[PDB]
Homo-oligomer: A and B are copies of this chain.
């Protein structure tokens, strides 16, 4: 009668900063045991501090989602130590190659965690889209493309794994206040505020709450869906 993720293990890729960090803390707040990942040892260490610092049981690991070996080994380490990850949030990220590489990483990781979810006959996979913030024309092409790829992928994977009570969903952030976007040139940021009906940048936490909800038992009938979290700014 609640959104408690007590007893569940969650894996959040790219958790050392920004959105991923905010997602790790939110799932922690909800009672999940949280494994966050980064590509470096110091990133993984930092994830661990942040967890203790906010009273979250879990760990930081080194993970490169572009390589089969890293993925296989990492998942093994988790299984042997903390249990099977039943919540998995892919947040660790020229148009063609970017999208092709991202989606190969989603599929890789998703397929690897699926054996565990299948066995438990329950699971949540949640895919975070790229943030809006794209120095140029290139960057609109790239965001629209990444979004279309995420959506069709998420929908297709949901249909494939649905019969096992595993939901698969995506979250498509708009213009979010992050360490990356605070660095954009003022003209570019203001031109983006001018496009957003809510008249402000979204917070990382505001992405994390959606992920938090999608991970809950309450969201059990939501699958193959891509939830936009963009303040009313839609770009396609």
Select A144's contact among B140, B145, B162, B234, beta carbons within 8 Å: B234
Residues from chain B with Cβ under 8 Å of A83 in the complex? none
Q: A151 vs B155: C-alpha distance in the bound complex, in angstroms? A: 15
Q: Is the CB of B223 within 8 A of A218?
A: no
Q: Is the CB of A225 within 8 A of B228?
A: yes
Q: A222 vs B159: C-alpha distance in the bound complex, in angstroms? A: 25
Q: How many copies of this chain does the complex contain? A: 4
Residues from chain B with Cβ under 8 Å of A100 in the complex? 100, 103-104
Q: A99 vs B155: C-alpha distance in the bound complex, in angstroms? A: 13
Stretch at the interface among A37-45, A55-63, A126-134, A190-198: A190-198
Q: A224 vs B227: C-alpha distance in the bound complex, in angstroms? A: 10
A231 near B: Cβ within 8 Å?
yes
A68 near B: Cβ within 8 Å?
no
CB proximity of A1 to chain B, nearest CB, Å = 8
Interface centre among A145, A159, A202, A210 (most CB of B within 10 A): A159
Interface centre among A104, A205, A222 (most CB of B within 10 A): A222
Residue of B nearest to A2 (CB): B2
Residues from chain B with Cβ under 8 Å of A210 in the complex? 213, 218-219, 222
**Which A residues lie at the B interface, using CB under 8 A?**
2-3, 29, 95-96, 99-100, 103-104, 107, 137, 140-142, 144-145, 147-149, 151-153, 155-163, 165, 174, 194-199, 202-203, 205-207, 209-210, 212-213, 216, 218-225, 227-232, 234-236
- A sample of 22 cross-chain residue pairs with beta-carbon separation below 8 angstroms, ordered by A number, consists of A2-B3, A2-B209, A137-B194, A145-B155, A147-B152, A148-B155, A148-B156, A155-B232, A158-B197, A158-B232, A163-B197, A197-B224, A198-B223, A202-B221, A209-B218, A209-B219, A213-B219, A221-B229, A222-B227, A222-B228, A223-B230, A235-B235
